[PDB]
């Protein structure tokens, strides 16, 4: 990719994400290592897609599709430079941390004396 000049950009629309959400998209995030897009909506669903415009039979194929029970997803983010854990949260008073190796999801629900401050 070239170094870009300050008046016009060579932007170029590629094959859009095939799976749509049933509500507004609250957060997008890219994996810091691999070309993997994580989308999260208010309809309690996170989608992980692999960026492959030249894929078959569907461009940008889906890796996994995680539904979180009863939590709308207001924000989801990758953790660290390696992109090892996904921390995701919504209106509720808890947030989950999902490790992408070994697959365990821990639900943090106490902020150690400041649980009154965090509604």
């Amino acid at each position: 990719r070239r170094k870009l000049r300050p008046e016009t950009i060579d932007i170029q629309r590629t094959r859009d994400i095939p799976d749509t959400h049933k509500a507004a998209i609250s957060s997008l995030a890219f994996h810091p290592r691999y070309p993997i897009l994580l989308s999260s909506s208010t309809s309690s669903i996170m989608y992980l897609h692999k960026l492959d415009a030249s894929a078959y039979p569907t461009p940008n194929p889906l890796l996994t599709s995680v539904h979180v029970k009863r939590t709308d997803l207001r924000r989801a983010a990758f953790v660290g430079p390696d992109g090892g854990e996904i921390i995701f949260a919504g209106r509720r008073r808890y947030f989950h941390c999902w490790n992408l190796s070994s697959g365990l999801v821990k639900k943090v629900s106490k902020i150690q004396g400041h649980q009154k401050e965090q509604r």
């Binding site: 309690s44 599709s65 995680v66 539904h67 979180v68 029970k69 989950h96």
Partner: peptide, 22 residues
């Protein structure tokens, strides 16, 4: 008051999805 997606429609989309986190 009116939520964006109600909990029953969240349940239906969770039936449609792949991996459910309780």
């Amino acid at each position: 008051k009116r939520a964006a997606v109600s909990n029953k429609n969240m349940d239906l989309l969770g039936e449609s999805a792949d991996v459910i986190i309780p």
